């Protein structure tokens, strides 16, 4: 009745429903409101390698898609939520994507640029820049799928607990 012991590097994907992430309905024309808000899970450490995909299935309250000229932004911040400016991973639009298949075929898998590394309290935020005419944001119907942990394609994110010198060298940012 064996299960198979495991490495600490759990390879997973990230979505809104998990209990370290929060959503928020948004109006049109604030590029600063955090739509999404990740936080450190209080003890573990997360590592997103550069070369990681996204599927930001963003829609409106009437279920329709947003304006493709909308710009999505992803950014690291401090433990108080103030962005660091640097450490940006993303700056592009929605029209680049195709919700029918944006998390299926690698020819369309839009991905990050740089790596990322979250301590027990660091925070990632996601921002949305739109003109006025849109039908806002409805997170209750929209969602996000970060990375893949199921396919022969794409990559995943590494969750780990605390191993000593790993953390010692990891905190040296």
């Amino acid at each position: 009745g064996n299960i198979g012991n495991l490495s600490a590097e759990k390879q997973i994907s990230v979505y809104d429903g998990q209990p370290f992430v929060d959503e928020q309905d948004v109006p049109a024309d604030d590029p600063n409101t955090p739509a999404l808000t990740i936080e450190g899970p209080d003890g573990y450490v997360i590592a997103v390698d550069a070369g990681t995909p996204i599927a930001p299935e963003f829609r409106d309250s009437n279920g329709n898609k947003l304006d493709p000229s909308t710009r999505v932004i992803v950014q690291k911040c401090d433990r108080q939520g103030n962005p660091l400016g640097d450490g940006i991973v993303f700056n592009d639009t929605l029209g680049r994507f195709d919700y029918e298949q944006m998390r299926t075929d690698p020819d369309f898998m839009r991905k990050t640029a740089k790596s990322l590394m979250i301590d027990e309290r660091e925070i990632v935020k996601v921002f949305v820049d739109i003109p006025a005419g849109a039908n806002g944001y409805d997170a209750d119907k929209s969602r996000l799928t970060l990375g893949d942990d199921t396919s022969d394609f794409g990559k995943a994110v590494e969750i780990v607990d605390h191993d000593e010198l790993s953390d010692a060298e990891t905190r040296a940012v």
Binding site: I12, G17, E100, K141, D149
Partner: protein, 225 residues
């Protein structure tokens, strides 16, 4: 010395158990894959062995004038592989059956946000219709059970949401699911698919039009002899 088989809704043995969950939102045992006498031992390997899960639930309604539309079904419906229009999909998002006429219904259209659907045949007043759509929300994982009935440990303690199984075109190679972890059986042991979801799921409704099983949980495995 091993080969590859699949565990299935029936699989290699007519002892596999199929039960349904509770309405109180609390995780339950969906399926128990119990290893048989015939075999020596069973192996699962996440990241090698594929898996397929077509869940499907139940709703019911009564007819009257103007009922060409069926409601938001308390289920966050999702398109299939991103695709919407029924006849082009890998499989039907939902099917329905008029009981009094005792026939199948074909569907006109869908609205996913409001979770509603639009049929072709306005049913009769006082008539009854059953619907079997997919299931929406849901968090699954694998559990181990000894011969005694005691929980040993969960596999890869990170649940899997349901709707990815709908989001990916499950048949395309590479796109198919490969969960994480490993697990190994013994003879009288059991492994259990567990789920937590708010809506009740079904199997083996007599009135299904396409097949004698509405929902399937197939999995690839390695087997010793």
């Amino acid at each position: 010395y091993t080969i590859s088989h699949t565990g299935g809704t029936l699989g290699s043995s007519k002892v596999t158990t199929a039960a349904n969950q509770t309405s109180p939102q609390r995780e339950t045992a969906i399926i128990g894959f119990e290893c048989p006498r015939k075999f020596a031992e069973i192996e699962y390997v996440g990241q090698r062995d594929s898996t397929r899960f077509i869940p499907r639930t139940t709703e019911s309604i009564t007819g009257t004038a103007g009922d060409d539309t069926v409601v938001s079904l308390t289920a966050n419906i999702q398109p299939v592989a991103g695709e919407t229009a029924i006849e082009d999909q890998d499989y039907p998002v939902a099917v329905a059956y008029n009981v009094t006429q005792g026939v199948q219904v074909d569907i006109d259209a869908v609205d996913y946000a409001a979770d509603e659907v639009t049929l072709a045949d306005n049913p009769a007043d006082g008539d009854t219709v059953k619907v079997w759509p997919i299931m929406g929300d849901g968090d699954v994982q694998f559990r181990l059970v000894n011969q005694f009935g005691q929980e040993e440990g969960r596999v890869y303690p990170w649940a899997t949401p349901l709707y990815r199984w709908h989001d990916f075109p499950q048949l395309k190679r590479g796109r198919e699911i490969n969960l994480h972890g490993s697990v190994t059986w013994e003879e009288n042991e059991t492994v259990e698919v567990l789920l937590d979801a708010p809506q009740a799921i079904t199997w083996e409704d007599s009135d299904y039009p396409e097949g004698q099983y509405v929902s399937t949980f197939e999995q690839d495995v390695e087997i010793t002899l």
